Symmetry: C2
């Protein structure tokens, strides 16, 4: 990905958040110059836990078709030390028809929430012992309502609805085509994108960056 | 507390949420009649973990001066079983100058978040061995920025800002007088209001009209 594209994507996502009355912490708007002037001793948590902006095309070449934009608001340490917090939160922008590829988490349990906008479609499979998709029925809880569904079921989350995805459950999601961008919330146990994602297809969680213009903001993986 | 007052409070809070583009799950709007027709097997998590609406005047007679309106969106079991989820979330409405009295949690660690509206003022004290306020410096992290402050400091959270409150840290909060109502988020470890709250000053519904909604303590 080009830095110019990242600058553009983040500008648009910040506007989308503002449109939904979403407010981010002050550090969400820091320029690289402002980051350079901070007391690094007071800000270790942001750096250590990779709080902040995340833009990915999942190692591929078409962000619009496969990609995601996220802001990690709070987190704890993957091991539990030195940041003892068990929980994490993200706020995400899923663009119309934009797909987050099929994956499960080894450890993280997450509630994926449609905070507003379009409709979030979530496709679900159990993983078999070969780490492939299983033919077995899935059991999930959608806003406290427990239910069983066929393997590969595609569930629609309207604004306000959320689903709890236990570790090991394969999931892919997208904003239903035509119904608009979706504001997605994530409230979960600790997030570790370095090690806790298993994609069905072997892919990279982050993209390498072509530095074609000055960065307006700093990504959480480049502190 | 009169049911008419609760109906009005929840009506106003739902409007406030809508004005802030906050969207709640379908169960947030269930009438008592609708709750009666639910499959009790499929919905046990809502009942068991007390998800949903909460309106409190903190046992007193002045909601406007001391009160809070909350919706618990997700939760887990206090002791980790049978609901293993370790996290919880609430969305709350703090009315202008409305105070939540000084309290700490024995177990819950929470991030209190100004999701929008006015400014949230949070007053903080360490707890002593005798469950009184200590005069020791407080160490808190505001949006990943670690800082130390004097005992009893009143810290301002503007929209977007959040503070992590570890267990045992006394806290009281209110919407800064004149800056408007505040939409408050809480993302935390498991919530247990039955046992996990200690108020510094230790803490019935009159059905005068039909209930429009059901509160989380009356399942
Ligand atoms: Mn996931
Ligand atoms: Mn509290």
């Amino acid at each position: 990905m080009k830095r110019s594209a990242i600058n553009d994507i983040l500008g648009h996502t910040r506007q989308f958040f503002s449109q939904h009355d979403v407010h981010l912490p002050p550090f969400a708007s820091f320029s690289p110059a402002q980051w350079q002037q901070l007391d690094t001793a007071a800000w270790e948590e942001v750096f250590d836990l990779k709080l902040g902006w995340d833009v990915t095309a999942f190692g591929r070449n078409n962000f619009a078709a496969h990609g995601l934009t996220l802001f990690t608001l709070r987190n704890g340490s993957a091991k539990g030390m030195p940041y003892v917090k068990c929980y994490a939160e993200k706020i995400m922008h899923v663009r119309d028809a934009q797909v987050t590829p099929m994956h499960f988490h080894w450890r993280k349990r997450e509630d994926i929430i449609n905070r507003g906008g379009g409709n979030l479609i979530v496709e679900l499979w159990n993983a078999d012992s070969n780490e492939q998709t299983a033919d077995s029925d899935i059991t999930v809880v959608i806003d406290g309502c427990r239910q069983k569904h066929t393997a590969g079921s595609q569930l629609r989350l309207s604004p306000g609805e959320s689903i709890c995805l236990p570790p090991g459950l394969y999931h892919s999601f997208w904003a239903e085509a035509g119904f608009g961008d979706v504001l997605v919330g994530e409230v979960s146990s600790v997030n570790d994108d370095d090690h806790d994602n298993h994609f069905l297809q072997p892919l990279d969680r982050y993209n390498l960056i072509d530095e074609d213009e000055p960065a307006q903001l700093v990504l959480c993986n480049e502190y």
